Every structure is written in structure tokens, then in C-alpha cells.
Amino acid sequence: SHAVKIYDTCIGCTLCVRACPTDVLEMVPATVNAAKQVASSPRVEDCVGCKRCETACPTDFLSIRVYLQENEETQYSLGLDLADWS
Amino acid sequence: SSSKSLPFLPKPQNLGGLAGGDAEFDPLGFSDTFDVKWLRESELKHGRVCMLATVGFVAEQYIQFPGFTPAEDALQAIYTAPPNITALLLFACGYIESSAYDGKLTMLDMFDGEGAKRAPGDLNFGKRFLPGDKAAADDLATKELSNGRLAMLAFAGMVHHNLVVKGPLFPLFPEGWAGPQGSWDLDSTAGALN
Amino acid sequence: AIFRYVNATLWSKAGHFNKALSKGAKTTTWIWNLHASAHDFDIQQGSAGLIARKVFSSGLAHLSLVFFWLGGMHFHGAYLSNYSAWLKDPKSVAPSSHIAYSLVGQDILNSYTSQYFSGITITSGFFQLYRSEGIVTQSQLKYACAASLIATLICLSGSYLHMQLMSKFTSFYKKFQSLSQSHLIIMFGFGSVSFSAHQIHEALPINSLLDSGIWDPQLFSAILLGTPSAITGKLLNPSTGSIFLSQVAAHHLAVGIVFITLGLIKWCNLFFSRNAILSLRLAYMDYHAQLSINLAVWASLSMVAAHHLTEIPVYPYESTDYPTVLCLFVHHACLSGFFTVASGAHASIFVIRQLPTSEIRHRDPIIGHLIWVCIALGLHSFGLYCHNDTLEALGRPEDTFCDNSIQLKPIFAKQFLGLQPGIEVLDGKIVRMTQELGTADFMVHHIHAFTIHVTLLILLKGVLYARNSRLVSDKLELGFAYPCDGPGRGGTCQISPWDHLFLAVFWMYNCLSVVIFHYFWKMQSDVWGSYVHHSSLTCSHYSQGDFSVNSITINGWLRNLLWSEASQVIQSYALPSICSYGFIFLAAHFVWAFSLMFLFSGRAYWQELIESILWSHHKLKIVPHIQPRALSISQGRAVGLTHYVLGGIGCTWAFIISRMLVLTT
Amino acid sequence: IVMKTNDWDQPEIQLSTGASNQINYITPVVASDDIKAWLSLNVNFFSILALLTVGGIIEIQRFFPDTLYW
Amino acid sequence: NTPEHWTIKASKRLELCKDNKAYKKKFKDELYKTEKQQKKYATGSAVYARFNKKIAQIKNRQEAYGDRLCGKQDGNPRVVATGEWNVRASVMWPASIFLYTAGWIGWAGRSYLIRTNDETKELNIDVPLALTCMASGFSWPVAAWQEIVNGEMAVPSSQIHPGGPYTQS
Ligand SMILES: CC(=O)O[C@H]1CC(C)(C)C(=C=C/C(C)=C/C=C/C(C)=C/C=C/C=C(C)/C=C/C=C(C)/C=C/[C@@]23O[C@]2(C)C[C@@H](O)CC3(C)C)[C@](C)(O)C1
Ligand SMILES: CC1=C(/C=C/C(C)=C/C=C/C(C)=C\C=C\C=C(C)\C=C\C=C(C)\C=C\C2=C(C)CCCC2(C)C)C(C)(C)CCC1
Ligand SMILES: CC1=C(C/C=C(\C)CCC[C@H](C)CCC[C@H](C)CCCC(C)C)C(=O)c2ccccc2C1=O
């Protein structure tokens, strides 16, 4: 699976969460920024690696980073449809 | 307000206050686009160079410096003249050009900051003879501009007459002259088609 | 109707049409997007009425452009051509309405065409077209040019007017029944009848006089006079080597009558199976659906034109004007391919913007079977060539697929003309000759089928999987032209219908290049050439009939077609006629190679290089406020594709034209 | 009758209640300022510059061919 | 072995073109080809006149190039790139004039950019100012040296983006 990390530069605009195609991310309460919320990545097992969160991130450099891990590819991260590894 | 020279066109508003503009004549709005100070400096320079040029163009056909092989067609005098002396002329012209403007030679540098208060064409040369009374001073400036413009047109005419006649200036029509029809001979689009 | 709203104020805005370009010129990507979306009237600011306005007015403006081009052609023929010399003696003088300047030694390009004329030999068949039309005078050509220019002005005025005449209530463009009926009865039926009238009344007497040898002004200013009872096409004009123009006029009269009859039966509702097409009628009332259908129709008609203009001779002396027939075939084949890939593109756009038809719901079997047929066709067809190569190299010709060895006879390729035995000749040239099909023709035709099927596979996959797929389920949300969906799910590069076209264009170009090479080599080897003396002639062909012996191997194609026949273009530098063709050969090679830059590289390298370069500009205080950017991914693909196709087409163009020009002169 | 169409190109359209004898100009309203702005657009500026440069080079080649002076 | 041999004129691989057999043969062949091409057309033809003009051009080219050096084997005129100004076909004159013109273009442009400092002006050119800068760029050598000396040309590297970060922050 890929690694989706969030950094404190986050401003809690929720655009990453809204752009998530498989609902990997969710906003959580925080005090670091004025919006009082920061995106989290609890369901990183479903991350496919499309980097749409990264596309939608406003900050100067991304407060959300998706690191691709081709060696640890799973069926959920590969979006397998015709074949099942479960 | 219609222009005096062209009563069917609007009067130019940015060229006022300069001698020789009695017939306000800027149909293309060059004074509007660019700075009239630079335009007038260039006009004076062209007038002076061109009147000196007409006098020299006439003189060279007859009289030349000792040595200095002649060229009846004064257009060829540049090639026929001593290259070192021609380079000396260029050197003197460059020295004068640099010194007169102190180094602010460009369209932006000149008439910028210091030197803007300087009159467009005033190089402080031979100003001891300028009449004190403003009426006579303006009349003299207008006379200079008129002679310069006439000299520009006259030099253009001299050069092109030499080109058409392929010969010296003074005989206006050489022996056997029949017309300038055959001078512009290089092929054109319409000419080649017809 | 209100023309006070057309002002030049918007001319300097440069991006008013697209709302996404409101933040003008923050980067060079803005310039590129402006150009890319200039003519995408659907996504531009306004309404559906405005979209229709723009579509129709742009069609009229392009009509005016084409009329201007035709008028320029007529003017060049009239004033800058040797049409007089060609008309009096077509064989000796090559057509040339093209003259070059003497700027930098460029006068070398002009070549001897006649005693008093020197220029560039044209290959468009315009001289033959004029001769068929009956145009034999500079005055006639001049008035044709004047008519074309007047038509250009009229079309320009029509576009400008219709930009405001049509309002939001305008609906005449949605009247499909009226549109089709008018086009079928007037534009096609009445048009064909009127052109038959023109032929009968003007071209037939003039052409008959020209065939006889009469050049009298009074005569220039009794149908079926010379045509025997022989079936049309079975007997060519002995003095011209083309179908009788009276037969052509009768053809046009019959075609116009048939079109009028079809229109009238449709008007009377005689056609009954409306329900079988009602689904398509409801679904495909869209700009892009109609554009795709029309593009495919015109592509197929262009291919049929390419085949017929050569196989069936109808223009005077075009049969013996070998460069003309070859260039016509190649040009129309290329247009067929381009318009077919265009039809695929706009089918994909229609699927994206509108609801698709129900054949998309079993798309997996369709594309799966197409994939299988493509694989099997390619394997068999190309592996026969590879087998021939390997076995011939090993030294076993008896094991190869050829007429002498194992032979694959095209049993289904059967005659239908029923022509008499022999060939038709005209002044030392073979105007018409039967093409004899064998193993080489079998193999090359199956190669053609393979390439066509692979191009169709790419286009159909792009069309059917445009809305969604197993990989990505929101391709509809992504749109039509996007680079990818991300590096995820393994990588979603070029999943868009735009990229499917970007690949189908490569495959169409490959198919058309093979088709061009097949036609060129087969015609040179087995059809074209001269003859040496009931009389029997031994026919000396330009390529010496080597297609049937050498075309069975890829090495034979490489040697006897490319290397052997590139002698003219490769050795064209000293020759005044074709030095330009040699230089264009070289430059097209350069451009094709230069395209690989964009086809192989990626955006990020160039963006980083641009930033490193911009460091120095910033250091020296050269700050471009339209910040430089690397070309987008889709733009890089488009640029690479354009340069690739242009370079390949230029190489083929120069090679074939140089060969033909040298051989015929 | 005046109607708002909600079209930027033709905000309003007028219909006649009967036969009318009125001026309806079909010519567009073009201003010299608008034309000057359009030509000031970087494209026209640089295209004119490049066309003049190319013409100058071509004319130099015409007038002094083969660089005999060099 | 001598300072005199430093000049490209005193080289064993080159010869004056007027004395080069290969150069003479090449030109003779070009003239023969042009005349043969001319002979095809009629005497009083416009193409005949054009071919006469081309033949004259070739002869004048031969006369002009006779002075230039060219290799013995091929006899094609060569371009001297040692730096000798007083030599035929010297590269210095074209080099100097091109360098002046290119610096003119660069200076003009940089000056427009500095004066405008706006993407809107970059897109819609301020034609008056652009022409003013183009005209002003003639003194670019002196102006550029003065700005370099006085520090108005280059800005410290700490004022511009250095690039990507190569270490931990
Ligand atoms: C202390 C200090 O600083 O010194 C002082 C000294 C001093 C003297 C006091 C000063 C001054 C003033 C000077 C030097 C003024 C000079 C003025 C001149 C030379 C004017 C020439 C005009 C020529 C014309 C109109 C030609 C016209 C020609 C025409 C119309 C020609 C026309 C034809 O050629 C054409 C065009 C074709 C020919 O075929 C036919 C003809 C007719 C010949 C200063 C400035 O204070 C400086
Ligand atoms: C002599 C000679 C030679 C040699 C040469 C050389 C070796 C040279 C060198 C050179 C060099 C080694 C140089 C250096 C440089 C450096 C630097 C550091 C620079 C910089 C620059 C700049 C900064 C610029 C700026 C500007 C201007 C001025 C103008 C335009 C714009 C701009 C902004 C770009 C040869 C043999 C070749 C040839 C013959 C002669
Ligand atoms: C080279 C390259 C670039 C860099 C190329 C750029 C930025 C193009 C430069 C555009 C110029 C400024 C347009 C002007 C036209 C040419 C300079 C014209 C030259 C004409 C000659 C005859 C002189 C990309 O950005 C890129 C992006 C994605 C895939 C592949 C590539 C790619 O291959």
C-alpha cells in the first residue's frame, strides 16, 4: 500500500478529502491552524495513489504527500476488478 | 480645433511651444506617441546634417582636397575618398555626439533628469549670436528649421537625381537624356506579371 | 439582426471566449490553452444559440477560405502556367502553374517544362480538370478565378451576417428532415443534373474538337456523336485514354435523377423501416455525432475517390500523367485516414457529452474480439513476411510463401468489369492494364486489413471506454482531454479518448504509409511503364515487375522500394528539377526525428530545466512576468504527434514525387 | 418590442409591430483605439517585427547576392 | 617555425582560389551546367534572360572569390577564424557586427521588461515604450558595462530562488 502523510502546514480546507476517490481521508479537530481541523489518512489501505489530494492541496508545497510503494502493492491499491486477492 | 496645415484633421496638442510649428502638422500623431523634445532634437540634427550635406554634395563635384581623388558622381565620393580620413570624420562626429549630450545619448537617457531643462536642439554652439529679443530669436529658430527641412528634401532630391541619371548632379539632363523609365529595372511582382 | 454589438474591443482581450482564461497571462500555459480552446465553441461563454451561431458562421468562413484557395489556383493556371502549351501537346509538356523566385540561387528550382516556360511541375491534375471542364482560354480561366473570388466574398459576408442574423430563437439548424431533404434533392440531385447539362452543352463539343485536333475560335464559341455501343469503361478514348465525357455526362444525369427519386420517395414516406433507425435518430442529434458521422462518410468517399481516380480513368490524359494520378491517390488516401481518425475523436466527444447508445453495454466482448482479430491478423499476415525473410536468408526459397513456392492464391479476388484481353496504350505509355493478383497481393492485402483493424481497435476502445472503465470509474467526470488520472492503480497514463486518438493517429499513419508503398510499388512494377512492339507488346515497367518477386520479403521492401527507388530523391541535389524535393526529404527526416523528443520525454524534466535557466535571467534582472512553463502533457503529445506525422508524410511525399518526376522526365 | 436575451453578444433584440422605415446598420462599430490595441497585442507586434526583419534579409540577399564584398 | 607562419595565409593546406585547379574546375562545371540548362529554352525567352543573369552572377562570384583561400584538394573558399582582421573571408567582422546586434536585441528587451514589470504589459505591448527601448538599445555596450560595474546588472543570488532543497530543514 501507499503512504499518505499529512503535515502541520495543513490549513483544513477539506479539498483533499473531497477529492478522495476511495475515501481515504477525513478531517479531524485540531488547534494548529485557524480552521481548527486537519485532514487525516486513516484508511490508507484503500489509497490507490492517484494523487488527486495532492492536486487539490493549496499550500505552497503540499501539506499532504502520497508516497508510492510499488513493492507493497495490494489489490485495493491496484484497483483490481476482474481478479480477487481476498 | 482643426489643424492649420490640414484643416480637415484635428489639431495636435502636444507639439505646442516649439518654433516652426506655425502650421501645426502632425497628421500621424508622432508628437502624441513620442516625446516632442526628442522629435525636435532629431529634426534639428537632420536639418543641420542635411544642409551641410547639400553644400558638400555640390562642392565635392568641383573642388577636392589636394590629392583626394575626385568623383563627379558625389555618391561615389564615399568609396573614392581616403578611408583613414573618412574614419577621421566618423571619429570627430562621434566625439561631438558623445560630448554634446554628456553620455545621455538614447531615447530614454536624453531629456531625463538633468538635461531635460535643456532646449530640444540647443547644444550651446554659436549662441553668442542669438538675438536678445524673443521675437528675433524665434524668427531665427524658424529660419533655421525651414532651411533645415528644405535641405533635407534637397539632399534627398540630389541623391535620387544622381541615382536616376547615373552621373554628376549639375547637368540636370545629361546628353541624350530620354527619361528615368529604365532606372528602376529590378523585377517586381506586377512588372513580371505584365 | 442587431449589429451594434460587433466591435473590435474584444479583439485585444485575447481569451474572452473562455472563462478559464479570465486571469490573463500568468504563464505560457495560458497562451497554449487559448490556442487549444479557441475553436471549442461548446465550452465557451454563451448559450446553445451562440454555439450554433459560431458553428454555422465558421463553416461559412471556411467555405470562403476554400473558395479563395480555388480562385488562387485558377489565377495561377491563367497567368502563371503553361496551360496553353500543355493543351496543344499534353504529352511533351508537363503541367506547371508554379514558378519560383531567383532570390538566393532559388531559380534552380524551376525546371524545363516547355520552350518558353520554366517552373515547378504541378501534380494536382488541375490542367486535366480544366480540359475536362472545357476551359481552353485564358479569358475562361480568368472568369473562373473571378467567380471564385466573388464566391469567397459572398461566403465571408454570409458568415459575418449570420453571426448576428441567427438569434437565440434560431432553430433552422435543428430541422434535420428539411436539411437532409434539401441537400438530397437540390444540392445533390439538381446539382448533378445541372452539371450534366453543363458537360453536354459546353465540355462535350470542346472536348470532341480537342480530340479531333480542331483549335478554331468559332468552333470553341449532337450528343453521343463518337461513342460506340461498347459499355462505358470497356472502351477508353483512343486519342485521350479516358472514359468518354458524354458517358460521364449521362452518368451525372442518371445520378441526379436517382437522387431526386430517392428524395421524392422519402418525401412520400415510401421508405418504411423508420423504427430500425429511430434509436440513432433520437441519440445522434448532436454536433459531435453529426461531425463524426460526416467525417467518416467523407473519409470513406475520399478513399473510394483515391482508388477510382486511378483505376477508372475519366480525366483527359490523367492516366498517362503518372505523377498526377499517384499524387491524387496518395493525397485522398491520407485525407481518408485523417478524417476517419477524426470521426473516432468526435464519436468519443459525443459519448462524453451525451448519452451513448446501448451497444456500449456489452463493450467488453466487442473490444475483446477485436483485440483477438487484430492479434491473429497481425500474427499471420506479418509472420508470413517474417517467415519468408528467415527462410530465404537460410537459403530455402522452396519453403517460403511465393508464387513459385508455397502460394496463397486470392481465390475471392474475382473480376467484375469483364474487359477484353490486352492493355490500353496511348503514345508510348500504358494508360490501363489489368492488375494480376498473387501471393504478394494476398499478403499485402491482409497487412492492410490488419492495420485497419488495429486502428479501428484503438478508436473503438477510446469511444466505448470513454465514460468509465474497470480502472477508473469517473472518466466522465475527468472529461475528454486529460493526461491521466494519476500514478495510481499501477498508472493511468493515456486513459482518455484524446490519448486514444493520439495513438490511433500513429496507427492510421502506419496503415496509410503501407498503403501508399503498396500502391506505388505495384503500379510501378505491374501497371505503369512503356511498351515495345494483331500486335503483341513487351511492356517495360518502371520498376521492372519486381513487386511479385521481391515484395514477399521485408528485405525486398527495404531494398527494391526504399533504397532502390530513393536514388532519385537522394541524388537530386545537382538536378534543377528535384533539388527542392531532396532538401525536403532531408528536412522531413529531421522533423520526424525531432518529434521523438516530445514523444519520449516528459513534462517535469523540461520544467526543471526551464527553472534552472530562469535562474540566470532573474540573476541578470530579466524577469518575464508571463512565467515560462513547460508544455502540458497533452500538448507535448500533440506536438510530438504532429511533428512525427508531418516528417513521415514529407519524406514519403518527396520520395515518391522525385521518383515519378525523374522517371517521367 | 425590446427583449432581453441574456446573450453577451446580443444582449437585446427588437421586433417590429409592423412595417417600419428605419436605419439598421449592418456595418460593425470599429474604433481606431480598438484597432491600435489589437495591433499592440504582443502577437501583432512581434509578427510585424519578424515580417519586417525577414523582408529586410530577403531584400539584402536580392541587392547584394553571394556576399562578394566579404 | 617562424612568427610569419602564424598567419593563415602561410599554410601548406590552403592556396589562393584564383590559382586553385580544383576551384577553377568546380566553377567551370557550374558554368557548363548553367549554360546547358539555358540552351534548352528559346533564345528570346524571359527564362533565357534569367539564365544570362545567373551566368553573370556565377562569373562575378568566381571573380570575387578568386582572392579567398581554399584547400588544394577540393578548392572551396574557406573562412578564417584565427582572429586576423585584415584577411579575406575573416570571421571577425561578421562576428563583431552580430555581437553588437544581438546585444542590442537583448538590451532592448531587458530594458522593456525592467520598465514595464507587469504581465499585462508583457501580453499587450506598450508599443511606444517598446519602440523607445529598441531605439535606446544602440548604446548597449557602454550602458551594460556601466551597469555591471555599478552593480545594477546582477542581483545577489540570495535575492532569487536557488532551486530545490537538497538537505533537511
Ligand atoms: C561661434 C560658433 O559656434 O560659430 C557659429 C558660426 C555661425 C556662422 C554664426 C553659425 C551659423 C550658421 C551656419 C553655419 C549656417 C549654415 C547654413 C547652411 C549651410 C545652409 C544651407 C542650406 C541649403 C539649402 C537650403 C539647400 C537647398 C538645395 C536645393 C533646394 C536644391 C535643389 C536641387 O538640388 C535638387 C534637389 C536637384 C538638382 O538637380 C537641382 C537643384 C535645384 C540644384 C553658428 C551656428 O552660430 C555657429
Ligand atoms: C578572439 C577569437 C577567438 C576566441 C574567443 C574566446 C576564447 C572568447 C572568450 C569569451 C569568454 C570566455 C567570455 C566570457 C564571458 C563571461 C561572462 C560572465 C559574461 C556575461 C555576460 C552578461 C552578463 C551579459 C549581459 C547582457 C548583455 C551585455 C547584452 C545582452 C543582454 C544581457 C543581459 C544578456 C576565436 C578562436 C573563438 C575566434 C577568433 C577570434
Ligand atoms: C522539448 C519539450 C518541452 C520543452 C519545449 C518547449 C517549452 C517549447 C518551446 C516553445 C517555443 C518558445 C515556441 C516558439 C517556436 C520555436 C522557437 C520556433 C523555431 C523555428 C525555427 C525554424 C527557428 C516540453 O515542455 C515538453 C513537455 C511535455 C512533453 C515533451 C516536452 C518536450 O519534448
Please write down the HEC assignment for all residues of chain B: CECCCCCCCECCCCCCCCCCCCCCCCCCCHHHHCCHHHHHHHHHHHHHHHHHHHHHHHHHHHCCCCCCCCCCCHHHHHHHCCHHHHHHHHHHHHHHHHHHHCCCCCCCCCCCCCCCCCCCCCCCCCHHHCCCCHHHHHHHHHHHHHHHHHHHHHHHHHHHHHHHHCCCCCCCCCCCCCCCCCCCCCCCHHHHHC
Q: How far apart are the first and last CA of chain A?
A: 15
Answer yes or no: is the C-beta of E106 below 6 A from any ligand 2 atom.
yes
CA–CA dist C30, C20 (Å, integer): 9
Determination technique used: cryo-EM
CA C372 to the chain's CA centroid: 29
Residues in a beta bridge with C98: C120
Is C615–E114 a contact, with Cβ atoms under 8 angstroms apart? Answer: no
Instruction: Find out whether C4 and D29 touch, Cβ atoms under 8 Å.
Output: yes
CA–CA dist C388, C394 (Å, integer): 10
Cα D57 to ligand 2 centroid, rounded to whole Å: 26
Give the pairing of strands C118-119 and C424-425: unpaired
Contacts of E88 (CB under 8 A, 6+ apart): D70, E67, E68, E69, E80
Instruction: Find out whether C228 and C256 touch, Cβ atoms under 8 Å.
Output: no
Ligand 3 binding pocket mutation candidate from C599, C603, C631, C634 (most atoms within 8 A of CB): C631
For chain C, the chains sharing at least 3 beta-carbon pairs closer than 8 angstroms are A, D, E
Name residue C337's amino acid: G
Closest to C566 (Cα-Cα) out of C644, C656, C664: C656
DSSP codes joined into one string, chain E: --GGGGSTTS-TTEEEGGG-HHHHHHHHHHHHHHHHHHHTS-TT-HHHHHHHHHHHHHHHHHHHHTTSEEETTT--B--B-SS-SSSTTBSHHHHHHHHHHHHHHHHHHHHHHHHH--HHHHHB--HHHHHHHHHHGGGHHHHHHHHHHHT-S---GGGS---S--S--
CA–CA dist B190, B112 (Å, integer): 49
CA–CA dist C275, C87 (Å, integer): 55
Residues in a beta bridge with C531: C539
Closest to A53 (Cα-Cα) out of A29, A17, A85, A77: A17
Cβ-Cβ contacts under 8 Å, E127 against chain D? 39-40, 45
Q: Phi then psi for C204, rounded to 5 degrees? A: -60, -50
Cα C650 to ligand 3 centroid, rounded to whole Å: 21
The 3-state secondary structure of chain D reads: CEEECCCCCCCEEECCCCCCCCCCCCCCECCHHHHHHHHHEHHHHHHHHHHHHHHHHHHHHHHCHHHCCC
C-alpha pair distances (Å), C193 with each of C130, C189, C204, C267 = 20, 6, 15, 19
Q: Which ligand is nearest to the CA of C27?
A: 3
Residues in a beta bridge with E16: E69
C-alpha pair distances (Å), C178 with each of C48, C192, C260, C512 = 20, 20, 14, 37
CA–CA dist C188, C193 (Å, integer): 8
Instruction: Find out whether A46 and C488 touch, Cβ atoms under 8 Å.
Output: no
CA–CA dist E117, D64 (Å, integer): 41
H/E run at residue C288: helix C287-311
Mutate to test the interface with E, among B108, B110, B188, B193 (most CBs of E within 10 A): B108
Q: Which ligand is nearest to the CA of C605?
A: 3
Burial of A17 (C-beta count, 10 Å sphere; 0-12/13-18/19+): buried
CA–CA dist C121, C324 (Å, integer): 10
CA–CA dist C474, E56 (Å, integer): 72
Q: Which residues of E, range 106-165, sit inside 8 Å of D by Cβ?
A: 122-127, 130
Answer yes or no: is the C-beta of C598 below 6 A from any ligand 3 atom.
yes
Ligand 1 binding pocket mutation candidate from B44, B48, B54 (most atoms within 8 A of CB): B54
The 3-state secondary structure of C386-419 reads: HHHHHHHHHCCHHHCECCCCECCCCCCCCCCCCC
Name residue E105's amino acid: I
B19: cell is: 518654433
How many CB atoms are closer than 10 A to CB C227?
16
C440: cell is: 504478394
Q: Which residue has 521485408 as its cell numbers?
A: C554
CA–CA dist B46, E73 (Å, integer): 54
CA–CA dist A46, A25 (Å, integer): 10
Partner-chain residue, chosen from E109, E118, E163, that has the shortest CB–CB distance to C612: E163
Q: Phi then psi for C40, rounded to 5 degrees? A: -85, 75
CA–CA dist C111, C121 (Å, integer): 8
Cβ-Cβ contacts under 8 Å, E125 against chain D? 40-42, 45
- Reduced to 3 states (helix: H, G, I; strand: E, B; else coil), residue C221 is coil
Contacts of C120 (CB under 8 A, 6+ apart): C96, C98, C99, C100, C109, C110, C111, C580
The 3-state secondary structure of E95-114 reads: HHHHHHHHHHHHHHHHHHHH
CA–CA dist C491, C485 (Å, integer): 8
Resolution in A: 2.8
How many CB atoms are closer than 10 A to CB E68?
21
CA–CA dist E47, C115 (Å, integer): 9
Q: Which residue has 474572452 as its cell numbers?
A: C16
- Reduced to 3 states (helix: H, G, I; strand: E, B; else coil), residue C432 is strand
CA–CA dist C586, C407 (Å, integer): 39
CA–CA dist C73, A41 (Å, integer): 67
Mutate to test the interface with D, among C10, C11, C156 (most CBs of D within 10 A): C11
C450-C452-C458 Cα angle (round to 5): 105
Rg (CA), chain E: 27
For chain A, the chains sharing at least 3 beta-carbon pairs closer than 8 angstroms are C
Q: What 8-state DSSP symbol labels residue C27?
A: B
Answer yes or no: is the C-beta of C647 below 6 A from any ligand 3 atom.
no
CA–CA dist C419, C235 (Å, integer): 9
Query: What sign does the CA torsion over E154, E160, E161, E165 have?
Result: positive
CA distance A36 to chain C (A): 30
Give the pairing of strands A37-40 and A26-29: antiparallel
Contacts of B63 (CB under 8 A, 6+ apart): none
Q: Phi then psi for C510, rounded to 5 degrees? A: -60, -45
C340: cell is: 476517419
Closest to C402 (Cα-Cα) out of C561, C560, C551: C551
Give the pairing of strands D12-14 and E14-16: unpaired
CA distance E135 to chain B (A): 6
Q: How many CA atoms lie within 13 A of C608 on its CB side?
A: 7
Answer yes or no: is the C-beta of E141 below 6 A from any ligand 2 atom.
no
Contacts of C586 (CB under 8 A, 6+ apart): none
CA–CA dist C375, C378 (Å, integer): 5
CA–CA dist C513, C337 (Å, integer): 10
Answer yes or no: is the C-beta of E112 below 6 A from any ligand 2 atom.
no
CA–CA dist C90, C664 (Å, integer): 13
H/E run at residue C315: none
Burial of C326 (C-beta count, 10 Å sphere; 0-12/13-18/19+): buried
Query: What sign does the CA torsion over C323, C325, C328, C332 have?
Result: negative
Query: What sign does the CA torsion over C315, C316, C319, C322 have?
Result: negative
Instruction: Find out whether C100 and C110 touch, Cβ atoms under 8 Å.
Output: yes
Q: Which residue has 471556411 as its cell numbers?
A: C62
Instruction: Find out whether C471 and A79 touch, Cβ atoms under 8 Å.
Output: yes
CA–CA dist B127, B122 (Å, integer): 9
Q: Which residue's CA lies nearest to atom 4 of ligand 2?
A: E83
